[PDB]
Design a protein around this ligand. Structure first.
Ligand code: ANP
Ligand code: ANP
Ligand code: MG
Ligand code: MG
Lengths: 288, 281
């Protein structure tokens, strides 16, 4: 497939810095297709130079698979701009990430919503799993809100790009969302994505709580083998907490499977009150 | 032209920023029945914020919804209850004040003079339909694209009671002395604000009279003080600004004359300014 526009530096424009990341910067910008009067709002993620342990040929390869994900719950790479720095063009999400969303609404968010988002993130992930792909960096900060009732998983592929996989590579890494095998041996698989998924749900049930507050990154491995795990969210019924605890098992193949999770959460979403107890010119990526 | 919405045809998703008498939200306009979710910006006015009755509020809202110019945002809808809510189109790139701040020097003459022409245009438009903005300022100019700015918040000041003399925060440092002293608002009082606005743009975001209380601005204006010549400005360009800050209101430039003096400069910018070089929408 193609579906990956290759843009020239004069076909996009960086307007405002959305926010800065660990290895780059994101931007509120405009896509301006050469040879036509159209301006499309987009998000431009620019990776810092020499930040990726890969040459351009390899980079562009991965961008094709990135630009080839077709699922309502996974964002699609729209275009790329390879030079002395790689820039990623994706659709602009006006309502930001889901983490900041559950934080701003520490409460006025009902159960139905929470279990809903869990089903969706489980759908995007399963999709990837079927296509035999590993996200390697799933977190509530990496889930964007298209509309309150439809969230998409963003940043597919980025980690593999920044060289997560590369064995000998010695570059930050999201330790607090990583499975023991990822932290210990840098092994990434679908069952290691499940751990991150379990951490993600946790972030959502706590309305944006930081995992292992205070606990240094370096201690996380030791605390995990000692048997420690993120605590049961207050609004969570033991039935819900266990599923998360099952995503945090040492044995990778023991952990649930996104397919099972979709059914397990789809079930609870039919009677949420029982499983969660809460008190209460400028076109568009779409029109193109 | 003014859609009247039910408190169920729109959702306030994220707070853009809660200003003086209210809050601006980033939400979704879900036309009842239709199958669309349009991103919009919802500004909600605090309660009792306005000294007027809804019956009248709606009137102004019809006017606000009638502004038809590419350089003046248009009131898409309204939701009248115990609070008034204004639905306008969402400007993802924000306002221009924040833009010149985040680009202290990446912006060349061509742009700056350009924006001055556009703002002059939107403003002229309102004068022509016999309307007064009353609160023009860099923060009230939103960026649709780097090369097209439209004036936002037409109507708000009026609504919040600027004209109701009897009715006791006001953008003092952008107001014509006649506004500050007698609460008088006219096209020629908008020109003063316009000059202060060009001042903001020419200083890449500087604050007007930074350090001087507001209760004192009335003084230093009669004492003859005015905003200092911006570094990148040529005296040719600075006088246009100074002329906008005259005591004799009818002696200040008119927008129609400003659209021409700035357009003339916009032809040879380097000579008037000196710098270093579901979801439709
Ligand atoms: N497509 C998009 N639409 C809207 N906002 C986006 C988009 N992509 C990224 N952002 C925002 O840009 C900011 C930076 O993105 P990014 O660097 O990917 O964040 P992050 O995951 O928090 N970084 P890190 O913790 O270093 O991995 C975040 O605050 C995101 O909300
Ligand atoms: N239509 C819009 N699209 C995008 N952002 C908007 C829109 N209208 C208002 N805003 C933003 O909402 C915030 C609050 O606006 P408003 O309440 O009008 O305050 P303001 O007068 O710009 N700010 P201040 O300088 O604090 O008085 C500002 O940061 C604006 O940039
Ligand atoms: Mg991200
Ligand atoms: Mg404003």
């Amino acid at each position: 497939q193609a579906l990956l526009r290759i843009l020239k530096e004069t076909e996009f424009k960086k307007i405002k810095v959305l926010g800065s990341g660990a290895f780059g910067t994101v931007y509120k910008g405009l896509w301006i297709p050469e040879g036509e009067k159209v301006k499309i709002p987009v998000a431009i993620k620019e990776l810092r130079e020499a930040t990726s342990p890969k040459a351009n040929k390899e980079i562009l390869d991965e961008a094709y698979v990135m630009a080839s994900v077709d699922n309502p719950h996974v964002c699609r790479l729209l275009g790329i701009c390879l030079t002395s720095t790689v820039q990623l063009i994706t659709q602009l999400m006006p309502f930001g990430c889901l983490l900041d969303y559950v934080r701003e609404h520490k409460d006025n968010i009902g159960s139905q919503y929470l279990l809903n988002w869990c089903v969706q993130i489980a759908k995007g992930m399963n999709y990837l799993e079927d296509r035999r792909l590993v996200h390697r960096d799933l977190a509530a900060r990496n889930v964007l809100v298209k509309t309150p009732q439809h969230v998409k998983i963003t940043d597919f592929g980025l980690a593999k790009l920044l060289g997560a996989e590369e064995k000998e590579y010695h570059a930050k890494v999201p330790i607090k969302w990583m499975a023991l095998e990822s932290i210990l041996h840098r092994i990434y698989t679908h069952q290691s994505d499940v751990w991150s998924y379990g951490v993600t749900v946790w972030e959502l049930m706590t309305f944006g709580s930081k995992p292992y507050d205070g606990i240094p990154a370096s201690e996380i491995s030791s605390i995990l083998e000692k048997g420690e795990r993120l605590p049961q969210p207050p609004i969570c019924t033991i039935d819900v907490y266990m599923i998360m605890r099952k995503c945090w098992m040492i044995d990778a193949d023991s952990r649930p499977k996104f397919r099972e999770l979709i059914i397990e959460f789809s079930k609870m979403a039919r009677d949420p009150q029982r499983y969660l107890v809460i008190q209460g010119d400028v076109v568009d990526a779409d029109e193109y």
